[PDB]
Amino acid sequence: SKVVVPAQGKKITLQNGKLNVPENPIIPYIEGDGIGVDVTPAMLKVVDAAVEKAYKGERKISWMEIYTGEKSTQVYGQDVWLPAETLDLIREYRVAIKGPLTTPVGGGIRDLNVALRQELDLYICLRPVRYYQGTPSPVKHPELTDMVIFRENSEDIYAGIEWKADSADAEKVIKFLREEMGVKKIRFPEHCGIGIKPCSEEGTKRLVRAAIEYAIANDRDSVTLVHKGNIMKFTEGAFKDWGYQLAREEFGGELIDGGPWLKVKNPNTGKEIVIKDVIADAFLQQILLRPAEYDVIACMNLNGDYISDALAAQVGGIGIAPGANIGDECALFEATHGTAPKYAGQDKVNPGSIILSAEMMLRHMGWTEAADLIVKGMEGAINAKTVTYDFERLMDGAKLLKCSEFGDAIIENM
């Protein structure tokens, strides 16, 4: 209705689990707020370039701008931050990609990135972090990190089930909890806010199954379940138990030693994947001290968030971290950083993040060659020290490029 669907271009179809991608698919993209206006032109350019090179003119993406965030209020009228047709169109066109989004305060509105996740039930937040040779890093050995994060998107304290201190609602559930449930452990029942943390069996096993299948599909060496289960027995504890249970029941897992850990034999390469767990506060330490011991990670919503952020800073890629949100019916790839208004429009921020989320998009579509050319580009650009401001401030002897130019530096290294 305000989106214009492209005249040339065909829809990706879902033929029972499998994507059936046409050679000219229509891909919805949400430009993003703030620096979205800078990073997204770069991405459309380096992806067009990479598919123009990969298939020598045969395949072409018909990009179709859909709207969310702040720009959506400028297109549909100041009150609509998330159009009902964005949800329909992502659902319909099957894969989309987006820039950073702004949720306003003062409006009673919850996180629009999280709204997209839950409203489209894109229950897998996949966060691949690896080191790219050359990026300035805070740590002595960033090349040791090559992990893939399977963060559960649909439950946990991120669902947003909460009530205000002094509201009637809060008053009511604290009353229920103390009176009917008999809780004595709320230290100050007056002027107290309550949040609800749900973890379900169907919730963790659809994530873990994703995680282990990824490890087989790519011969990763293990799957670590990270949780804060010693303290949060019935949710985090639950998550680990149900995760282990699935590796045993659906993937034939067997105990190594006298447990806890399991072995899963990869039905394609013969190699054994270790299913193991580590408590989430110690894990924060283990990724810094022993990173090469960890590889595919599976975790609930909140931890997954903290872990991915932490991992991305260690390897120097806070501005180049990619992300995908994946469900059973459509997928959403995304720049994993903020809108950075201070700089918006100055063509100067790094477009790494959203570009690499676009090679994940490309890979997901089976356009392996195109995706492989973007990471070919990235490594080359980075390695050529032909970098954008944020990496140049920390490198000695690099060439400062603008955003669009790092775009071009990626196509020149392809």
Added chain:
Amino acid sequence: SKVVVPAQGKKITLQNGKLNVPENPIIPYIEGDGIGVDVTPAMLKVVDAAVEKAYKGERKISWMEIYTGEKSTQVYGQDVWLPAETLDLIREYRVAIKGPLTTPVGGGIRDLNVALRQELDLYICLRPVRYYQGTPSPVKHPELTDMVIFRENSEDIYAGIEWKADSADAEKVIKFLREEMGVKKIRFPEHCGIGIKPCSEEGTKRLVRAAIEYAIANDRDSVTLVHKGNIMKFTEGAFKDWGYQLAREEFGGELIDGGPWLKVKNPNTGKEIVIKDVIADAFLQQILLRPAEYDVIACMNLNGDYISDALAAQVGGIGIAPGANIGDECALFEATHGTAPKYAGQDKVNPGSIILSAEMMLRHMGWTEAADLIVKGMEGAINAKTVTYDFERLMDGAKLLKCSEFGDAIIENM
């Protein structure tokens, strides 16, 4: 009743907020399980040595063993993990110190360290992490870190208010939430575990007040409130708002720029402390990339846990991190690491942690000279590369000492 109170020795008295320490105070200590049997002899020895040197024979601690954990079942009978008189005796004798504690599984028992915290309402978990020149570190610049963590101990998802997936209890509160509260955001109401996260006003302002008073008492440059408030508005959001509010209302805070941040003028040195906040996932990144920007930190229970663990690994001090739990009526200092059974009794683990928690104990008692000698010792021992196994594996050219001997290496450098 099974504890033997020392014949010589006088109780510390609390004269309205102020401690009145006698020159021969009785200090309860809990030996600890696992390597508690190794680390605690070292600590009693290096503290006796440091007070023997500081006051030249005038002052002496009368150590009194009280019992919790596994050893408590061997003293009071296999069922009692936490004796009611440990709580009375810590309450009574005012400051105690402990080793690592074991909570069993299969018993329905919750975390005994957390039980001590809540049962004695030691609502401040203070975690000072700094770099000690010489410790092997995973990061390029560990000397940039000198932060003090004020982690709230009595509320949040750590209270332990939770119910099992498929229990009647869980069934009941999910029913209440969906039916009476009208929640539509629990993705899978069947086979779902529920945890309760409470944050109260009285809860956050008694922690924040502790934090800001610490910054004035020691001229620290700022207090960062870290929270996950953009997503958890009514608890984390609440915590930040109430924290800012207290800096304004009780400490005269004024906006820097057009806010959010505040300035508090230290009423003793004239310097302005900045009260600021950062969202907890980005903070995990900021401590790695810009650590010198952060100093006194104030946060809820769970984050505080993850932050302190993360900070301690960056500065190389996972085995030498100290901790105190402080309330309005008694204090509990502690080795912040596990019982490490694999090694228990082999006299080989690092006793850094509990020793440094003992200089915090000593400082808290006003025995500044003795405390200053332990950190004098530590720096010297570490710097002499006369180290225990865990630091020696990572140093080139160090001397491997046993646990007791690192004890002695600390007294030799005093």
